[PDB]
């Protein structure tokens, strides 16, 4: 009766009260429990007919099942998607999340678990204020709901409600004695979540609740969280709380002013100067208690200016937008210690805007600082390397000379990031293996683009030596793409992806210079992927010989002169002559095929299955394995 259960599940989800009654008519007690209580799969969700009835808001279906069939309100199933694989939720949790007040009242009156706990300790009240309906929140609390019950990350019903713009439920929960000093998994309180959400009404009620402002697990006040969020309204309400003393309130005014200088959606020069000048005015007005800032030494990435201590300095650079952004960045990292989540990202936006108007030199050094800090923070920078290579490609297409030591240090960052991805996929389990491999492939492709643009730049002897040394280090690290392609295979392939930006103007594959550089750094010229294709097999299959015969001839002769065994066979026993699909590449390989007795002897050894284990040189066992 599996098909009947699917029909019952379909009827409840579709709200067909007539069809559901006909399907459930003349059914025994065992049949009713089998039909109402079975978990059905549809669209990636494993939900029961009663569970799916609450999500869709079919009150008539819910009332019909609960009143007559007295189905128990303890069914478990996988509900929702998009980062929500929460299991064990009852029908009450689904209705609360979907914002259906009538279903919740019907379920609770029939015996729903008000304090039900899912796998991640989720209360129906947690999902009730998630949607934003005050009646559902009021009904559950009146039905003996424990607000203090949170998840494993310690996010109570007030914290989950403060994420969204539901002012009615957070104020109501404060009336029911919601704890304002609770600490989340990263030491976070409800004030931290409300500050970043840009809700002055929610934040101002917490300070009326004596929120007891305290830093999070990382060590930043919720005032600083709203300061970096470029929310001046949220920041300019804590001064009346009379608990920020003087250092905390003046560092937030600087942080708020600094944040306006670097934002994609909250950038404005006039407001940035107004708050920064006001922060400077309050520091230098009392005189006896004058506030002085411990300015870090001038970082070469941060221009050449060591902030503006004198009052005349800040007024003088008001008209200069570049210095206005630069002064905000220095105090942005100074407050946070330059090791926070959102320190480098505003710098990335500053450089990208700076690169949109034919200005390059100061754009580069900003991203080096962004690349430097994220490496210390164990942060993957595949997107940063990708955009950096894109900007170099745009410079080269504009026949602009790209500075080479920047390429050297970026290549060092690239090999470090690739090693970080290597030991990450060594330690990361199957939970995020797909994302880890995607970042791995992106890192390898960005490194190849960087090698290509290095070969497209006329550099010095020592700079080229350093670049080749770094490539040698990465080659000895021996990366492997998910297809088994080594660094050499991707440099000779035509299917190697290139991003849609200006990299197509410069970077292209196969590229003769990149393959020559890889072979110069001692790459594995006979590397065999999972399928069996060698480094030679990938370019003898190249489908556009005549158009770029130079870059096929160069790579073929470079591979052959580097020791690529031209008679090597894949797992299907196909020599690169067989896997040619082209007369030009086949004959151009044949001109490089120095026939040797060693190859014929190895082929005759392996053809008739002669036991060559430990009876031949160790350098010949792999040679026989080539055939």
């Amino acid at each position: 009766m599996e098909g009947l259960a699917g029909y019952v599940y379909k009827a409840a989800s579709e709200g067909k009260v007539l069809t559901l009654a006909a399907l459930l008519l003349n059914r025994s007690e065992s049949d009713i429990r089998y039909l109402l209580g079975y978990v059905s799969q549809q669209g990636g969700q494993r939900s029961t007919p009663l569970i799916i009835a609450a999500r869709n808001g079919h009150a008539k279906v819910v009332r019909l099942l609960l009143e007559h069939y007295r189905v128990q309100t303890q069914q478990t199933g996988t509900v929702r998607f998009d980062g929500y694989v929460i299991d064990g939720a009852t029908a009450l949790w689904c209705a609360a999340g979907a914002g259906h007040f009538e279903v919740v009242k019907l379920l609770v009156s029939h015996g729903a678990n008000v304090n039900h706990t899912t796998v991640t300790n989720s209360t129906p009240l947690r999902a009730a204020c998630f949607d934003g309906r005050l009646d559902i929140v009021k009904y559950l609390v009146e039905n003996n709901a424990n607000i203090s019950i949170a998840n494993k990350y310690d996010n109570t019903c007030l914290m989950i409600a403060a994420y969204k713009g539901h002012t009615d439920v957070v104020r109501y929960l404060l009336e029911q004695r919601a704890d304002p000093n609770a600490k989340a998994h990263c030491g976070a309180t409800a004030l931290h979540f409300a500050a970043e959400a840009g809700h002055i009404d929610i934040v101002k009620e917490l300070i009326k609740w004596r929120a007891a402002i305290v830093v999070n697990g990382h060590g930043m006040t919720p005032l600083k969280v709203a300061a970096e969020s470029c929310k001046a309204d949220v920041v300019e309400l804590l001064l009346s709380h009379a608990d920020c003393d003087r250092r905390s309130r003046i560092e937030a005014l600087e942080l708020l002013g600094a944040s306006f200088a670097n934002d994609r959606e909250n950038y404005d020069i006039i407001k940035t100067y107004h708050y920064l000048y006001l922060a400077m005015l309050e520091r230098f007005q009392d005189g006896d208690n004058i506030l002085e800032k411990e300015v870090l030494p001038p970082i070469h990435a941060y221009g050449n200016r060591t902030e503006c201590r004198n009052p005349q300095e800040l007024e003088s650079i008001r008209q200069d937008r570049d210095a206005l952004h630069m002064e905000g960045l220095i105090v942005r990292e100074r407050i946070l210690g330059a090791d926070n989540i959102d320190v480098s990202h505003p710098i990335i936006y500053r450089g990208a805007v700076y690169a949109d108007n034919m200005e390059f030199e100061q754009c580069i050094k900003l991203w080096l600082h962004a690349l430097h800090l994220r490496q210390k923070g164990n942060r993957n920078t595949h997107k940063d390397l990708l955009r950096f290579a894109q900007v170099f490609s745009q410079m080269i297409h504009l026949n602009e000379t790209v500075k080479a030591p920047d390429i050297e240090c970026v290549l060092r960052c690239s090999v470090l990031e690739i090693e970080q991805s290597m030991n990450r996929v060594k330690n990361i389990s199957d939970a995020d293996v797909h994302n880890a491999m995607d970042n791995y492939e992106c890192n390898l492709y960005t490194f190849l683009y960087l090698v290509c643009i290095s070969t497209k730049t006329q550099c010095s002897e020592e700079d080229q030596c350093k670049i080749n040394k770094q490539i040698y280090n990465l080659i000895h690290l021996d990366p492997r793409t998910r297809e088994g392609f080594t660094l050499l295979h991707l440099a000779v392939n035509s299917n190697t992806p290139v991003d849609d930006f200006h990299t197509n103007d410069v970077c292209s594959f196969p590229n003769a210079l990149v393959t020559k550089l890889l072979l110069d750094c001692g790459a594995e010229v006979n590397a065999v992927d999972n399928e069996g294709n060698s480094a030679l097999h990938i370019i003898v299959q190249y489908n556009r010989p005549i158009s770029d015969f130079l870059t096929l001839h160069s790579i073929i002769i470079s591979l052959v002169e580097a020791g690529a065994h031209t008679d090597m066979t894949n797992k299907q026993n196909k020599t690169p002559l067989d896997k040619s699909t082209t007369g030009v590449s086949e004959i151009l390989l044949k001109t490089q095929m120095k026939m040797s007795l060693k190859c014929l002897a190895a082929r005759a050894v392996r053809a008739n299955d002669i036991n060559y284990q430990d009876q031949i040189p160790r350098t010949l066992e792999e040679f026989v394995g080539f055939h």
């Binding site: 936006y349 450089g351 990208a352 805007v353 949109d356 997107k383 955009r387 900007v391 930006f501």
Partner: peptide, 8 residues
């Protein structure tokens, strides 16, 4: 382009 689409 840059910050137009690469920012995200």
């Amino acid at each position: 382009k840059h910050s137009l689409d690469l920012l995200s």
